[PDB]
Amino acid sequence: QRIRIRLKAFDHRLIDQATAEIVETAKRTGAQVRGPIPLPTRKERFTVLISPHVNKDARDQYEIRTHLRLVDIVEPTEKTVDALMRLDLAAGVDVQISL
Amino acid sequence: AKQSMKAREVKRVALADKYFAKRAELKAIISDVNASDEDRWNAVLKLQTLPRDSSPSRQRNRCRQTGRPHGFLRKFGLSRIKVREAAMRGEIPGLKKASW
Amino acid sequence: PRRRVIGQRKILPDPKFGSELLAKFVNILMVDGKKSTAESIVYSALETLAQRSGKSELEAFEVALENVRPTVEVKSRRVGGSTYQVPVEVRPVRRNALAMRWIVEAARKRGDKSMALRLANELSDAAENKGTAVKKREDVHRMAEANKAFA
Amino acid sequence: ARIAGINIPDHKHAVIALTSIYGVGKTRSKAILAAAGIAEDVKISELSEGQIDTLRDEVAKFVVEGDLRREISMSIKRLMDLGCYRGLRHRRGLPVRGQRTKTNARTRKGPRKP
Amino acid sequence: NQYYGTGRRKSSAARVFIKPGNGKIVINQRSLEQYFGRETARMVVRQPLELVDMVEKLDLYITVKGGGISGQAGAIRHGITRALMEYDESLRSELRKAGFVTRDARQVERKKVGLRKARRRPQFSKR
Amino acid sequence: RSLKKGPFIDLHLLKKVEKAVESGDKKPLRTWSRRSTIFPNMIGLTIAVHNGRQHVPVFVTDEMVGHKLGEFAPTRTYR
Amino acid sequence: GQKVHPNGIRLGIVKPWNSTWFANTKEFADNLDSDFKVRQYLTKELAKASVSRIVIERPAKSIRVTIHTARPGIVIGKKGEDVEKLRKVVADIAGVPAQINIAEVRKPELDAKLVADSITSQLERRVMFRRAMKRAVQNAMRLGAKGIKVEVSGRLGGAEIARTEWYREGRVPLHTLRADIDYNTSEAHTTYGVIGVKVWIFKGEI
RNA sequence: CGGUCCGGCCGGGAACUCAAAGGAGACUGCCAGUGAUAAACUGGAGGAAGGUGGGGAUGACGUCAAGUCAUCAUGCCCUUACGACCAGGGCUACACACGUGCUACAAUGGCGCAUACAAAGAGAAGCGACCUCGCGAGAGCAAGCGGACCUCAUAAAGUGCGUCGUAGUCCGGAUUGGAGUCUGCAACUCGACUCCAUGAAGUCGGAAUCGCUAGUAAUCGUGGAUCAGAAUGCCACGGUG
């Protein structure tokens, strides 16, 4: 049918490297690649008190940005499927394979 | 927190996994269903014979490192102080100071 | 502004008449950022204050302002250990601002039903050289004439 | 005019005039006017006497009048004579429904006294 | 042909397509009077094609998202100015002097820690 | 203000009450279950309800049915 | 005044994270706790191995740990039996299969963690604090550091009233985010309480 | 541009909004004048932006033996108790005084009907649609959604029409009585919410005092953390202004 790949990471350079690796794996296999479409970034935020006792007015605001990429292959030759299903990507990147 | 407080939390988690996972879910199901035995389902009396610590509502989220019962964050499982300590040392992935 | 010399912000003209005076009047009458609520009041008051006289609207509003506009006011001063009141000459922009603010506070201190009616009556009184806005202008001029020695 | 609820309602919109009865709020007033067949925006004047008799016939279904005062007095008296927690809170003029007494009990305690 | 211009304000972004000749204005499949019941919002939208004499000389097709009444009206004004400069490019000086080519960058200031609002600080007691 | 799926009563107190009514008049019932609802079969018995330090004797009457036991044992001393 | 943590303020700017995995909310706290336990065990076991930094990354269904140490032969040992024993228990702590790499710290005199550890060890050996601080500063500066300052605090030399002392050489621009500032701390547990040591090492910008 | 149940919905298109990665752009760079021919300052052009463009993070040496031994770590005392387990109670008391807020005293408003325009977020022992039942809180059944897709989720001030007509009122909602819903072993002390009923003070606040310089104050809604349940607090978001 068709395979879409959802990539998640906290660093955007890492997710871009992973997406580049994926599109090279696919195009060098001879499949067609739709993407990579940059999906909106989900940035969680946290506000914590930096004092051990009181001092509520003293706080630090932290955040975690989750970067999203979507890669679609329209006709996934068996070559493409079993090529990408054994790709080696960075540790901080989460990859989903939907069929 | 004291050692006894952490031991209490551990025991409560264990009891909640043992009983309320299946038995108390069944009993509360019998209690909430309107179609079943509107007179003597007997489930209400059996729900109180179970240990109290088996109720998940009696668990208190404490920092996984210190046991602090206040300022907890479910995302990290730590209190605000230990969250900040780990964040500044670069031990929480992706977390950094925010500005906008 | 200890050192700050400051410019001027862009006030938009009135949608109905195209006057900056009426726009600032609506701004002064506005509360809680409800500009549409204040514009209806000002327009109803100007309409009601139009048929009475006969000189359209803008003209009636300016005639009402001419009687409330203060020429000279007193500025408190602490030099000789007591309340000095030096009568200073009012600038035209501050003149219009004071006139409009006085008319609004006088209309809000009235017993009529709606703010449109209160405004219409206050403006008609001002055109007739009476009311509480003209009263306040005469109070200010009186206080200036009393302290003319301190110019 | 006058209703089975002795009280005399003012001559104004029927939905609001019927509120003067002790025990009839806005919802019950609307329900009375609906079950009777009278519009809500009509004054008490312009109402025929046959229409006021109709309103009386409908308000007779509710316990809304010194009768209701009696039922409320009976409940508070039962609470006080029972000696329960709410009975004691009623005896001492203190808030009954868990409100704080450190500050802000001025409706039950009245004007403050040093 | 269509001359396009993108206008923006606080949270709004208007897509304005102008075409040669008529007095028609359509905002989001609605007329100007239907879309803007506030007369200031209509005066702001009509404002740029008044310095340049266009009564029934340009047809406007507008869509706008985000923001409120005034933000959307300012975004439409900005987009109309941009489309007019795309259409003639000699009207640049007039729309500059009027102040319409400037993007109003006034955004809502964020809420800060320890303050009740962007600048509103809590009530201070000394003694 | 508990749902309408039946009132609550602690089971130990329930069995104590049945044993007390089936065996005839007895001594006051010492209990800590201030949260139990007073049932009609408790009319006539005197339940000693804990209030924090003592067990306050509460002679149950028909007018008390529906209340919780702790409603008749004040926990705070104020003079 | 209180200063921002110089490491955390530069995370993503010029400083990398010590934990580089991705996880959702479900496994985030579990991974954090497991990383904490792994780092704790490794710091306790390799106390005499000059371990300066423990980087933890979690591939798909495993964990690999990189130990930055200035004594790699001690961590590895004869025929790697020691690092094998370390891996076999890191795998138990983390639950998933484990892998351990050893990264050498070529210049221990330029690592803030190792300098702080050296100073705290000297303080616990009853060595004069001024001497230790100046030796650390000199060793770091003669090895090409652009700047260094170390600071010790709390009952120095057994004093009844605590005191904070700091020595500074070169350039330490804590307000420049482009500045590569290596910062770490350590505590000396003495007979008179805790003495906290802080070290800043500046290694240039960009 | 074709088709259309008029719904970007479906062929399609890659233009535009937008998404998110890279780049450009602002430097007193240019012009004029002043100025020790210096640094700079005043104005102008151009430009989306002009003079550290707006906001944030960033807090020097030190001061207050300032706060925290109750996050944590750490250099006298207890130890069949100053340790540990349990049930109930208390932290929620109440003559009173203070700080910080919310709601008001109304007509720039209350109520009724109709209708318009956001942004930012959260969600798997979770968010939970549609439909049915209930006056309602909710209940039953049961999709979709680890989510630019599904759900929370109807923005509200606003606008149109009607009414109220200055009164302790169709303002105000306190308090109290009755009847319920949900969470939870369990709502008595001591939960939140709904319905019916009741309708305190309050008609703009003494001495005094606070915040705020522009998308700011003022006002209007929205979301999140903690959390089984329990926000008028906190943290954030946009509308009008």
Side-chain angles (χ1 to χ4, degrees), chain G residues 1-4 9 25-26 161 166 175 189-194:
Chain G
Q2 282 68 245
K3 295 158 189 47
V4 76
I9 195 61
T25 303
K26 177 196 228 71
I161 290 182
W166 57 278
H175 272 71
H189 293 343
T190 53
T191 43
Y192 301 111
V194 186

Coordinates of all heavy atoms in Angstrom, one line a residue, chain G residues 1-4 9 25-26 161 166 175 189-194, chain H residues 57-63 65-66 73-75 123-125 146:
Chain G
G1 N 24.4 38.2 44.8 CA 23.3 37.6 44.1 C 23.5 36.1 43.7 O 24.6 35.6 43.7
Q2 N 22.4 35.5 43.3 CA 22.5 34.1 42.9 C 22.7 34.0 41.4 O 22.0 34.7 40.7 CB 21.2 33.3 43.4 CG 21.2 32.9 44.8 CD 21.1 34.1 45.7 OE1 22.0 34.5 46.5 NE2 19.9 34.8 45.6
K3 N 23.6 33.1 41.0 CA 23.9 33.0 39.6 C 23.2 31.7 39.0 O 23.0 30.8 39.7 CB 25.4 32.8 39.5 CG 26.2 34.1 39.9 CD 27.6 33.8 40.2 CE 28.3 35.0 40.8 NZ 27.4 35.6 41.9
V4 N 23.0 31.8 37.7 CA 22.4 30.7 37.0 C 23.5 29.6 36.9 O 24.7 29.9 36.9 CB 21.9 31.1 35.6 CG1 23.1 31.3 34.7 CG2 20.9 30.2 35.0
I9 N 22.4 26.7 31.5 CA 22.1 27.9 30.7 C 22.6 27.7 29.3 O 22.1 28.3 28.3 CB 22.6 29.2 31.4 CG1 22.0 30.4 30.7 CG2 24.1 29.3 31.3 CD1 20.5 30.4 30.9
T25 N 5.5 10.5 27.9 CA 5.2 10.7 29.3 C 5.2 9.4 30.1 O 5.5 9.3 31.3 CB 3.9 11.5 29.5 OG1 4.0 12.7 28.8 CG2 3.7 11.8 30.9
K26 N 4.8 8.3 29.4 CA 4.6 7.0 30.1 C 5.9 6.5 30.6 O 6.0 6.0 31.7 CB 4.0 6.0 29.1 CG 3.8 4.6 29.7 CD 3.5 3.6 28.6 CE 2.4 2.7 29.0 NZ 1.1 3.4 29.0
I161 N 33.6 29.7 62.2 CA 32.8 30.5 61.4 C 33.1 30.2 59.9 O 34.3 30.3 59.5 CB 32.9 32.0 61.7 CG1 32.4 32.4 63.0 CG2 32.3 32.9 60.6 CD1 32.5 33.8 63.4
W166 N 37.8 32.2 47.0 CA 37.9 31.8 45.6 C 39.1 32.4 45.0 O 39.5 33.6 45.3 CB 36.6 32.2 44.8 CG 36.3 33.7 44.9 CD1 35.7 34.3 45.9 CD2 36.6 34.7 44.0 NE1 35.5 35.6 45.7 CE2 36.1 35.9 44.4 CE3 37.3 34.7 42.7 CZ2 36.3 37.1 43.8 CZ3 37.4 35.8 42.0 CH2 36.9 37.0 42.6
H175 N 28.8 35.4 31.6 CA 27.6 36.0 30.9 C 27.6 35.7 29.4 O 26.6 35.9 28.8 CB 27.6 37.5 31.2 CG 26.8 37.8 32.4 ND1 27.3 37.6 33.7 CD2 25.6 38.4 32.6 CE1 26.5 38.0 34.6 NE2 25.4 38.5 34.0
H189 N 33.6 15.9 52.7 CA 33.0 15.6 54.0 C 34.2 15.5 55.0 O 34.9 14.4 55.0 CB 32.2 14.3 53.9 CG 31.0 14.4 53.1 ND1 30.4 15.6 52.8 CD2 30.2 13.4 52.5 CE1 29.3 15.4 52.0 NE2 29.2 14.1 51.9
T190 N 34.3 16.5 55.8 CA 35.4 16.6 56.8 C 34.9 16.3 58.2 O 33.7 15.9 58.4 CB 36.1 17.9 56.7 OG1 35.1 19.0 56.8 CG2 36.8 18.1 55.4
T191 N 35.8 16.4 59.2 CA 35.3 16.3 60.6 C 34.5 17.4 61.1 O 33.9 17.3 62.1 CB 36.6 16.0 61.5 OG1 37.6 17.0 61.1 CG2 37.1 14.6 61.3
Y192 N 34.6 18.6 60.4 CA 33.8 19.8 60.8 C 32.7 20.1 59.8 O 32.2 21.2 59.8 CB 34.8 20.9 60.9 CG 35.9 20.7 61.8 CD1 37.2 20.6 61.4 CD2 35.6 20.7 63.2 CE1 38.2 20.4 62.3 CE2 36.7 20.5 64.1 CZ 38.0 20.4 63.7 OH 39.0 20.2 64.6
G193 N 32.3 19.1 59.0 CA 31.2 19.3 58.1 C 31.5 19.2 56.7 O 32.6 18.7 56.3
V194 N 30.7 19.9 55.8 CA 30.8 19.8 54.4 C 31.5 21.0 53.9 O 31.2 22.2 54.3 CB 29.5 19.6 53.7 CG1 29.6 19.4 52.2 CG2 28.7 18.4 54.4
Chain H
rA57 P 13.0 37.1 32.7 OP1 12.3 36.7 33.9 OP2 13.5 38.5 32.6 O5' 14.1 36.1 32.3 C5' 13.9 34.7 32.2 C4' 15.0 34.0 31.6 O4' 15.2 34.5 30.2 C3' 16.4 34.2 32.2 O3' 16.7 33.4 33.3 C2' 17.4 34.0 31.0 O2' 17.6 32.6 30.8 C1' 16.5 34.5 29.8 N9 16.9 35.9 29.5 C8 16.1 37.1 29.7 N7 16.6 38.2 29.3 C5 17.8 37.7 28.7 C6 18.9 38.4 28.1 N6 18.9 39.8 27.9 N1 20.0 37.7 27.7 C2 20.0 36.4 27.9 N3 19.0 35.6 28.5 C4 18.0 36.4 28.9
rU58 P 17.4 34.0 34.6 OP1 17.8 32.8 35.5 OP2 16.6 35.1 35.1 O5' 18.8 34.6 34.0 C5' 19.8 33.7 33.5 C4' 20.9 34.5 32.9 O4' 20.4 35.3 31.8 C3' 21.6 35.6 33.8 O3' 22.6 35.0 34.6 C2' 22.1 36.5 32.7 O2' 23.3 36.0 32.1 C1' 21.0 36.5 31.7 N1 20.1 37.6 31.9 C2 20.4 38.9 31.4 O2 21.5 39.1 30.8 N3 19.5 39.8 31.5 C4 18.3 39.7 32.2 O4 17.6 40.7 32.3 C5 18.0 38.4 32.7 C6 18.9 37.4 32.5
rG59 P 22.4 35.1 36.2 OP1 23.6 34.5 36.8 OP2 21.1 34.6 36.6 O5' 22.4 36.6 36.5 C5' 23.7 37.3 36.6 C4' 23.6 38.4 37.7 O4' 22.4 39.1 37.5 C3' 23.6 37.9 39.1 O3' 24.2 38.8 40.0 C2' 22.1 37.8 39.4 O2' 21.8 37.8 40.8 C1' 21.6 39.0 38.7 N9 20.2 39.0 38.4 C8 19.5 38.1 37.6 N7 18.2 38.4 37.5 C5 18.1 39.5 38.3 C6 16.9 40.3 38.6 O6 15.7 40.1 38.2 N1 17.2 41.4 39.4 C2 18.4 41.7 39.9 N2 18.5 42.7 40.7 N3 19.5 41.0 39.6 C4 19.3 39.9 38.8
rA60 P 25.7 38.6 40.5 OP1 25.9 37.2 40.6 OP2 25.9 39.5 41.7 O5' 26.6 39.2 39.3 C5' 27.7 38.5 38.8 C4' 28.9 39.4 39.0 O4' 28.6 40.7 38.6 C3' 29.4 39.5 40.4 O3' 30.3 38.5 40.8 C2' 30.1 40.9 40.4 O2' 31.5 40.8 39.9 C1' 29.3 41.6 39.3 N9 28.3 42.6 39.9 C8 27.0 42.5 39.8 N7 26.4 43.5 40.3 C5 27.4 44.3 40.8 C6 27.4 45.5 41.5 N6 26.3 46.2 41.9 N1 28.6 46.1 41.9 C2 29.7 45.4 41.5 N3 29.8 44.3 40.9 C4 28.6 43.8 40.6
rC61 P 30.2 37.8 42.2 OP1 30.9 36.5 42.1 OP2 28.8 37.9 42.7 O5' 31.2 38.7 43.1 C5' 32.5 38.9 42.8 C4' 33.1 40.0 43.6 O4' 32.5 41.3 43.2 C3' 32.8 40.0 45.1 O3' 33.7 39.2 45.8 C2' 32.9 41.5 45.5 O2' 34.3 41.8 45.7 C1' 32.4 42.2 44.2 N1 31.0 42.5 44.4 C2 30.6 43.7 45.0 O2 31.5 44.4 45.5 N3 29.3 44.0 45.1 C4 28.4 43.3 44.6 N4 27.1 43.6 44.7 C5 28.7 42.1 43.9 C6 30.0 41.7 43.8
rG62 P 33.1 38.3 47.1 OP1 34.2 37.5 47.5 OP2 31.8 37.8 46.7 O5' 32.9 39.5 48.2 C5' 31.8 39.4 49.1 C4' 31.2 40.8 49.3 O4' 30.7 41.3 48.0 C3' 30.1 40.9 50.2 O3' 30.5 40.9 51.6 C2' 29.3 42.1 49.7 O2' 30.0 43.3 50.2 C1' 29.5 42.0 48.2 N9 28.4 41.4 47.6 C8 28.4 40.2 46.8 N7 27.2 39.9 46.3 C5 26.4 41.0 46.8 C6 25.0 41.2 46.5 O6 24.2 40.5 45.9 N1 24.6 42.4 47.1 C2 25.4 43.2 47.9 N2 24.8 44.3 48.4 N3 26.7 43.0 48.1 C4 27.1 41.9 47.5
rU63 P 29.6 40.2 52.7 OP1 30.4 40.2 54.0 OP2 29.0 39.0 52.2 O5' 28.4 41.3 52.9 C5' 28.6 42.6 53.3 C4' 27.3 43.4 53.4 O4' 26.7 43.5 52.2 C3' 26.3 42.7 54.3 O3' 26.5 42.9 55.7 C2' 25.0 43.2 53.8 O2' 24.7 44.5 54.3 C1' 25.3 43.4 52.3 N1 24.8 42.4 51.4 C2 23.4 42.4 51.1 O2 22.6 43.2 51.5 N3 23.0 41.4 50.2 C4 23.9 40.4 49.6 O4 23.4 39.6 48.9 C5 25.2 40.5 50.0 C6 25.6 41.5 50.8
rA65 P 22.8 40.8 60.4 OP1 22.0 40.2 61.5 OP2 23.7 42.0 60.7 O5' 23.7 39.7 59.7 C5' 24.6 38.9 60.5 C4' 24.6 37.5 60.0 O4' 25.8 36.8 60.6 C3' 23.4 36.7 60.5 O3' 23.0 35.8 59.5 C2' 24.0 35.9 61.7 O2' 23.3 34.8 62.0 C1' 25.4 35.7 61.3 N9 26.3 35.5 62.4 C8 26.6 36.4 63.4 N7 27.5 35.9 64.3 C5 27.8 34.6 63.8 C6 28.6 33.6 64.3 N6 29.3 33.7 65.4 N1 28.6 32.4 63.6 C2 27.9 32.3 62.5 N3 27.0 33.2 62.0 C4 27.0 34.3 62.7
rA66 P 21.5 35.6 59.1 OP1 20.7 35.3 60.3 OP2 21.4 34.6 58.0 O5' 21.1 37.0 58.5 C5' 20.0 37.7 59.1 C4' 18.8 37.7 58.1 O4' 19.2 38.1 56.8 C3' 18.2 36.3 57.8 O3' 17.3 35.9 58.8 C2' 17.6 36.4 56.4 O2' 16.4 37.1 56.5 C1' 18.6 37.4 55.8 N9 19.7 36.6 55.0 C8 21.0 36.6 55.3 N7 21.7 35.9 54.5 C5 20.8 35.4 53.6 C6 20.9 34.6 52.5 N6 22.1 34.1 52.1 N1 19.8 34.4 51.8 C2 18.6 34.9 52.2 N3 18.4 35.6 53.2 C4 19.5 35.9 53.9
rA73 P 19.3 13.0 53.1 OP1 19.3 11.5 53.1 OP2 18.6 13.7 54.2 O5' 20.8 13.4 53.2 C5' 21.7 13.1 52.1 C4' 22.9 14.0 52.1 O4' 22.5 15.3 51.7 C3' 23.7 14.2 53.4 O3' 24.6 13.1 53.6 C2' 24.4 15.5 53.1 O2' 25.5 15.4 52.3 C1' 23.3 16.3 52.4 N9 22.5 17.2 53.2 C8 21.2 17.1 53.5 N7 20.8 18.1 54.3 C5 21.9 18.8 54.5 C6 22.2 20.0 55.3 N6 21.3 20.7 56.0 N1 23.5 20.5 55.2 C2 24.4 19.8 54.5 N3 24.3 18.7 53.8 C4 23.0 18.3 53.8
rU74 P 24.7 12.5 55.1 OP1 25.6 11.3 55.0 OP2 23.4 12.4 55.7 O5' 25.5 13.6 55.9 C5' 26.8 14.1 55.5 C4' 27.1 15.4 56.2 O4' 26.2 16.4 55.8 C3' 27.1 15.4 57.7 O3' 28.2 14.9 58.3 C2' 26.9 16.9 58.0 O2' 28.1 17.6 57.9 C1' 26.0 17.3 56.8 N1 24.6 17.4 57.2 C2 24.1 18.5 57.9 O2 24.8 19.4 58.3 N3 22.8 18.4 58.2 C4 21.9 17.4 57.9 O4 20.7 17.6 58.2 C5 22.4 16.4 57.1 C6 23.7 16.4 56.8
rG75 P 28.1 14.0 59.6 OP1 28.9 12.8 59.5 OP2 26.6 13.9 60.0 O5' 28.8 14.9 60.7 C5' 30.2 15.2 60.6 C4' 30.6 16.3 61.6 O4' 30.0 17.6 61.1 C3' 30.1 16.2 63.0 O3' 30.9 15.3 63.8 C2' 30.1 17.7 63.5 O2' 31.4 18.1 63.7 C1' 29.6 18.4 62.2 N9 28.2 18.5 62.2 C8 27.3 17.8 61.5 N7 26.0 18.1 61.6 C5 26.1 19.1 62.5 C6 25.1 19.9 63.1 O6 23.8 19.8 63.0 N1 25.6 20.9 64.0 C2 26.9 21.1 64.3 N2 27.2 22.0 65.1 N3 27.9 20.4 63.7 C4 27.4 19.4 62.9
rG123 P -0.6 15.3 28.3 OP1 0.3 14.7 29.3 OP2 0.0 15.7 27.0 O5' -1.7 14.2 28.0 C5' -2.6 13.8 29.1 C4' -3.9 13.2 28.5 O4' -4.6 14.2 27.8 C3' -3.7 12.1 27.6 O3' -3.5 10.8 28.2 C2' -5.0 12.1 26.7 O2' -6.0 11.4 27.4 C1' -5.3 13.6 26.7 N9 -4.9 14.2 25.4 C8 -3.8 15.0 25.2 N7 -3.7 15.4 24.0 C5 -4.8 14.9 23.4 C6 -5.3 14.9 22.0 O6 -4.8 15.6 21.1 N1 -6.4 14.2 21.8 C2 -7.1 13.5 22.8 N2 -8.2 12.8 22.4 N3 -6.7 13.4 24.0 C4 -5.6 14.1 24.2
rA124 P -2.1 10.1 28.2 OP1 -1.3 10.6 29.4 OP2 -1.5 10.2 26.9 O5' -2.4 8.6 28.5 C5' -3.1 8.2 29.7 C4' -3.9 6.9 29.5 O4' -4.7 7.0 28.3 C3' -3.1 5.6 29.3 O3' -3.7 4.5 29.9 C2' -3.1 5.5 27.8 O2' -2.8 4.2 27.3 C1' -4.5 6.0 27.4 N9 -4.6 6.5 26.0 C8 -4.2 7.7 25.6 N7 -4.4 7.9 24.3 C5 -5.0 6.7 23.9 C6 -5.5 6.3 22.7 N6 -5.4 7.0 21.6 N1 -6.0 5.1 22.6 C2 -6.0 4.3 23.7 N3 -5.6 4.6 24.9 C4 -5.1 5.9 25.0
rA125 P -3.2 3.9 31.2 OP1 -2.1 4.8 31.8 OP2 -3.0 2.5 31.0 O5' -4.5 4.1 32.2 C5' -5.8 3.9 31.7 C4' -6.8 3.9 32.9 O4' -6.7 2.7 33.7 C3' -6.7 5.1 33.8 O3' -7.9 5.4 34.4 C2' -5.8 4.5 35.0 O2' -5.9 5.1 36.2 C1' -6.3 3.1 35.0 N9 -5.4 2.1 35.5 C8 -4.6 1.2 34.8 N7 -3.9 0.4 35.5 C5 -4.1 0.8 36.8 C6 -3.6 0.4 38.0 N6 -2.7 -0.6 38.1 N1 -4.0 1.0 39.1 C2 -4.9 2.0 39.0 N3 -5.5 2.5 37.9 C4 -5.0 1.8 36.8
rG146 P -3.8 8.4 16.8 OP1 -3.3 8.7 15.4 OP2 -4.4 7.1 17.0 O5' -2.6 8.6 17.8 C5' -2.8 8.4 19.2 C4' -1.8 9.2 20.0 O4' -2.0 8.9 21.4 C3' -0.4 9.0 19.7 O3' 0.3 10.2 19.8 C2' 0.1 8.0 20.8 O2' 1.4 8.1 21.1 C1' -0.8 8.5 22.0 N9 -1.1 7.4 22.9 C8 -0.8 7.5 24.3 N7 -1.2 6.4 24.9 C5 -1.7 5.6 23.9 C6 -2.2 4.3 24.0 O6 -2.4 3.6 25.0 N1 -2.7 3.8 22.8 C2 -2.6 4.5 21.6 N2 -3.0 3.9 20.5 N3 -2.1 5.7 21.5 C4 -1.6 6.2 22.7

